[PDB]
Amino acid sequence: SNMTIRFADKADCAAITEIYNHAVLHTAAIWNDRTVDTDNRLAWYEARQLLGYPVLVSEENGVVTGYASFGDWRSFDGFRYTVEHSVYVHPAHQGKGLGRKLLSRLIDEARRCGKHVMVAGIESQNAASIRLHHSLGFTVTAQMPQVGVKFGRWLDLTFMQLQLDEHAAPDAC
Amino acid sequence: NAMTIRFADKADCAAITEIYNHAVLHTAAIWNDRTVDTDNRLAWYEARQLLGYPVLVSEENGVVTGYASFGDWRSFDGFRYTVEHSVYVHPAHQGKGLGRKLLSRLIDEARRCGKHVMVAGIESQNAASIRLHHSLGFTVTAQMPQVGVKFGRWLDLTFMQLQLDEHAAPDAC
């Protein structure tokens, strides 16, 4: 059968690491300059599993073409219904609808996990990501000039968010 | 003469601790429910000092009446010119201009640390903190609904920021 969106396995972690490292080296999407090893992303993957948070891959005849996941925006208790997510498509497979397929599914999984808000931290010149999010119902709630640096230049940050329900705020426990 | 702003001493950490915990128990300024001990804030103070970051206190005839500090907004490399600060005035010493004196002084230290931007994470009902920041030239750059929860209600987040220089590009690696 053919492309699939599925939950990642531990064995996907090397493909994930390669995509992650490419984004570190070649995009303004990750505001760090540290490439990592397979075990780093394995530990990341496992921490997500422990919280029951999805790590998703897109695949075509058995090869990983992209990934998506979310985690807590911040570790403090008051943020426990807000997640910050990310989507990375292998550079050779970008512009083919995989980002929308991954994010669409991630939204479903966020609703399943009981989350209230998804937060996208997008570098302001990333028109593809801003459009991707717009098309899945996200709205711009921040525009923060010169709060990042990479490649020797200031970066601007756009926050976009999607509120997943209109429920009342939960109790303490 | 009766009142000063100064750098904090290790001996101020007990006073800082109780102001911090009061804010934990009774405000939406800290989106958590964990109170801390003196050693905890001691370590926090000492960690700020390793990075060359200020802890400041306001005092009146010897009594600590308020404190302010900043740290890295995020730990990733790309944020190394951006700090996130906080200011807390003792519950018995508010509305007397201490907030502004502390913040104004903290601004000077942020510049001395060569920072480009200060980010304030303010819960949107905190009119006092909003006014204070506006009075020192911060501008609102985010309005993010329902990203927190405390006290049975959704919390909304206002980001305000102040750009500290006009450098065209980062100037310190």
Ligand SMILES: CC(=O)SCCNC(=O)CCNC(=O)[C@H](O)C(C)(C)COP(=O)(O)OP(=O)(O)OC[C@H]1O[C@@H](n2cnc3c(N)ncnc32)[C@H](O)[C@@H]1OP(=O)(O)O
């Ligand atoms: C919160 C987020 O994680 S921010 C960081 C996102 N990741 C990155 O920036 C890393 C590098 N980029 C990528 O991996 C991908 O290109 C992504 C995730 C941004 C998008 O994934 P793709 O598979 O390329 O996106 P997809 O093909 O589904 O297209 C998404 C939208 O972008 C639009 N688009 C594509 N290129 C551009 C462009 N250059 N300018 C404007 N819009 C564009 C498409 O028309 C499409 O619009 P639609 O959804 O309204 O039809």
Ligand SMILES: CC(=O)SCCNC(=O)CCNC(=O)[C@H](O)C(C)(C)COP(=O)(O)OP(=O)(O)OC[C@H]1O[C@@H](n2cnc3c(N)ncnc32)[C@H](O)[C@@H]1OP(=O)(O)O
């Ligand atoms: C990024 C920030 O750290 S966000 C978190 C800030 N800290 C907290 O919220 C913790 C609890 N609150 C506090 O500690 C204090 O109320 C602070 C730090 C917000 C303000 O400290 P104060 O010493 O009261 O501030 P100060 O006397 O300088 O007054 C600041 C402004 O708020 C106004 N103000 C004071 N109290 C109130 C109030 N209850 N409601 C509305 N406005 C108020 C003052 O008029 C002044 O405004 P102006 O310049 O327009 O006249």
Ligand SMILES: [Cl-]
């Ligand atoms: Cl929008």
Ligand SMILES: [Cl-]
């Ligand atoms: Cl609903």
Ligand SMILES: [Cl-]
């Ligand atoms: Cl109390």
Ligand SMILES: [Cl-]
């Ligand atoms: Cl209360």
